[PDB]
């Protein structure tokens, strides 16, 4: 369907391509800022009762990228049938173990039809060593550090399908707060920092009962086909245990996901997001 | 007298009815092969040994339908013997002579060969017009190498059979014993004399006592073997287990975290391994010629198709992932499926390969079970938050606090337990001769698997456990007569340090010419999954997944010791070859190999295991080998993330392709950053005996010409910036010029018609993996 | 508790040749695509903190009034004491040298450098209040 799309530009490197639960965590830091505690109540409410966010993906000069479903590794000897037979090996296992597709390969996987994948990934994940000196006497004492690097003309994206009066005065003016902030890693080298804009995306989807989640979800029940992705986080200097959540492209059947709340011993609850994104998408046999 | 059972004469019977081969190709008895090998075996029976190898002798004696044919002859021979000497039945000892009989026509297809030829060799699985000669499985003293000698003079067959002589002779008759003789003598030689014959003796013996031993515990008597059904009915049961996710399992650690315990999870991993494969071989009471493969993370078992026995695997592989996910949360996971399969789906039957059909629905089952990662837990998605979960700072494991130890080496660190364990595992790797299994609540228990624990056996200590799991030999030494005898290999060399130990980081970066950085190796082989489906019979997988592995369990340890220096040449080298190379190898599965070490020696590695490997095969499979140097401070998560998104790299482009070093490129599509194998040793052999003469030294009256090579690099990168030559062709022939030197590269100079008209680079691009590597290496 | 961002925007101009450095021998840091230089903002930022701890270590008699974290900091560092903090101004070792980094929020809210800066602490945090963006 029409979704929103919201483009966030980087201003430098980013620590990791921020998942679902930590846009959410980043978005409900900036309602609490601005608005105070009595709107993240009701933040959270309409993500309950309505909207739904994804995880952030990466796009290249007008070309969004979307994960690639879990589908298409059942039936891929079925997708290419009509290929010959001497590169049909090669041709699979590369298929096979990309990650990303654009709007044109990927409404090709969901209806199980041929794709490609693309050739050049928009971002590097870069080793920069640091150091640290003694004050005094400056003796060097270096460590490693991680960040991602964007192409000139490359960034971030992730996708909102809610009402237009909750994205109005809840998602875009987080947006604009977690631009001067950072958005997850060590925002006070300047990384996580971007410029917003604001499109309007459309993904032509399969009716079916089955769907793939563009977000990780936390399950309620046991899913078809999936990725565990287990990771946990950190609330205000408090660290939050490892769940099990499920990736962006797992495949679900009529599975809403459900939004977890931690009691953490903190002033307040830590809700983390865990909620599906659905595409309708059709299964092998 | 002595009580025998049935599963051990069938077992054993078909692990020897082609024993008369050997000993028929070496001209001793004159006789039909069944002939001479049942006279081989009465006359084993009358020197010291057992008494059941007159019974024995049954087996080979008649397991041809010619021989067979009788059913009166068979009858008498037995009243001429006695079966009840050894408990045996009547019925029950007529019945295995059928069971070894059909057995020998699944093993392999039955095409009769009329005369055998007179003594052609064993022709290699990777190149069918090629043969091996005859030598001893050692790996030691020769690297087999498929040449073009053709035939086998009848003095070392005879040479064979008097050291075969002696060895069944001090084994006590079972089958664990039975196999590691079989396996050092008869590897190197042909089942069925003919042109083009690929399957070795050894494993056309190993996998007919497979399916008699499968066929046996089914419950196919005689007459269903004279009738059919059982190559019409799903009577066996192709088992195959995956291990996923175990680059995630081994290179997860921090900056905590030695190599010394780097190289301990990778022990642990082969022990898990072996634990859940011994286990389904007791339950289902196999033995270990049913286990077609073991190497890296992924068997097949050939087993039979009961109710019975599908109630055992459904539990095997519960409590397994059970164990598994409570041990180490969603990092490594097994997928265990079994097909059930029929005779005919044996072999070839109406011109298709009906086997290579069967695995490929195997195979299928593999996938879709990877994509379910842990749905047999019931608790897996369900969330329990009981309070105070610590981690662990040299893995990741989350725990609940309070189970973190004090460590041996830091005490102000809290590590998990099993990271307490693996450390002292890493203290005694250079003085351990293998593992024995026993129950997991006994004393001495330093690694625990799913299903057993197992106690580490020292150089100088007696082993305890139920069966023995002993490392890189096929000789069995100061171990109980019923401890189990399992031999594994392993590539297992590392560089010692002054003490006994695994050498550091630390002791690897240094002695490295040039600059100290550490180098890392990853590779495998490539297309190696067509490769194992082209066979036809399970004695053909049985051969090719067998040398297929030897190369990197046995064989790549001779190459870092110089050996085999004939075959391999002249490789792009820094220095001369030292006697003991600061080389660790971490991991060296069937197509895989992770190895660090100095990264003047990580880089001549690379190109002396190619060259080695272009002639273990028939250059038919070749390698695709990522380099890599790095820091030496750097996490082994993050050294491992680099090569492996360094060696796809050098995989998706053309497949047979090095990656050397970091490259600069300009983004046109027709620059790939990774050199062809015979590309960059035609660059070495050019460009590098001009300008360096090793040892970190260049070549005379080009002393004090450091800065020099920088600036042919600087030049390179107008290249990168923007091609067609904008104004690099006569800068090169102006730095050239002002020196006096102009022999040093000509190509470098003039623009290169050969490459335009084909769309290739120049030939100043391809410059930077040779000059950039003489430059480390003459850093200091 | 928040109120707004003042922001600083301006030119860094190298009036003399600038080298930081990565490990031509000795390349300085650059972008990993365009290949062009460029100033990290954890070398900005870390210079900012170093000259400012300096200023603070000097002057730690006469700001007490004013920041009353100061009071428990005599100068120098704890180098000659291989032991955490007690009493010297560069207290906090992070792997072989020494710093300046309290070791509370309430402690980190009244020192001139950590209320700015930033502070890690053991069992409270302080984070920073400035960004350095490259
Ligand atoms: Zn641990
Ligand atoms: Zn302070």
Redesign the interface.
Known sequence: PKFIAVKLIP???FRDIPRADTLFGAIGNAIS??HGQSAVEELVDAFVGGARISSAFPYSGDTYYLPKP?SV??ALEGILTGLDEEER??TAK?LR?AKYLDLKNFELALRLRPFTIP?EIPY???????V?????????????W?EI?F??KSGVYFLYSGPREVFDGYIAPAMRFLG???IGGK?????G?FEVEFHEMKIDAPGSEYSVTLSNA???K?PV????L?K?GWSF?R?K????FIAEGSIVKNDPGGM?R??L?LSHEVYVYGLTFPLGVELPE | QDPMEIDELTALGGLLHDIGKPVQRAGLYSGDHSTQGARFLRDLAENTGRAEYELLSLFSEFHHKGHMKNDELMIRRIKELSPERFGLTMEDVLNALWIVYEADNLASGEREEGQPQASRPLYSVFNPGKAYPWAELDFEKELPVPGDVFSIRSQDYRELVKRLWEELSKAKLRSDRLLPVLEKYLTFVSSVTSEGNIISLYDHMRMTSAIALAMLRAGCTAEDVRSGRCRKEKRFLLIEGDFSGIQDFIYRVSGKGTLKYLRARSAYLELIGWDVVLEILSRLGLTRANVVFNAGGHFMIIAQNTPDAVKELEEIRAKAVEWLYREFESDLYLAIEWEPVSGREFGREGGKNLFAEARKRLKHKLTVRKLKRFGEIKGLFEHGHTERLAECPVCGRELPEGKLEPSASDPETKVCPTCNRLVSLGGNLPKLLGFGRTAKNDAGVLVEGPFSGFVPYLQGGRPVGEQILVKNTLNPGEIPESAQFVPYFVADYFKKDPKGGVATFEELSMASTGTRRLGVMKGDVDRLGEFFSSMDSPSKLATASRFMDYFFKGYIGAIIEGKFGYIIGDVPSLRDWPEEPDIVVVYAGGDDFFIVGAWDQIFELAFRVRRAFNAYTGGKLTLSVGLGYFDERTPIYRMADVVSERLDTAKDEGRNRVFVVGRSRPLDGKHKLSYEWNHYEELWRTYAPRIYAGNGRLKGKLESKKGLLWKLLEIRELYVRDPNDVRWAYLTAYLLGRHGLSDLFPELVGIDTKAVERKEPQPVYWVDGVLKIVLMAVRR | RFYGKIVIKGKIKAVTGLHIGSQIDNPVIKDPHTGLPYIPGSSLKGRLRSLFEILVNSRLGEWREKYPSLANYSPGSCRPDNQENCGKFFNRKINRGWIHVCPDYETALACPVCRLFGASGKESNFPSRIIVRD
Not at chain 1, 225 to 228: D, G, I, S, T
């Open positions: 201003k430098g490197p800022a601005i879990l590794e059942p090996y090669t590369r173990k050739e590097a994940r870069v080793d920069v060593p640091r640290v000196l003694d004050r005094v006497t400056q003796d060097s004492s270096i460590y490693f991680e690097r192409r000139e001067d902030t950072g925002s006070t080298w300047g990384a920092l936390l399950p309620t046991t086909l999936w990725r565990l287990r946990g200097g660290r245990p490892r769940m099990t977890e931690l009691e011993g």
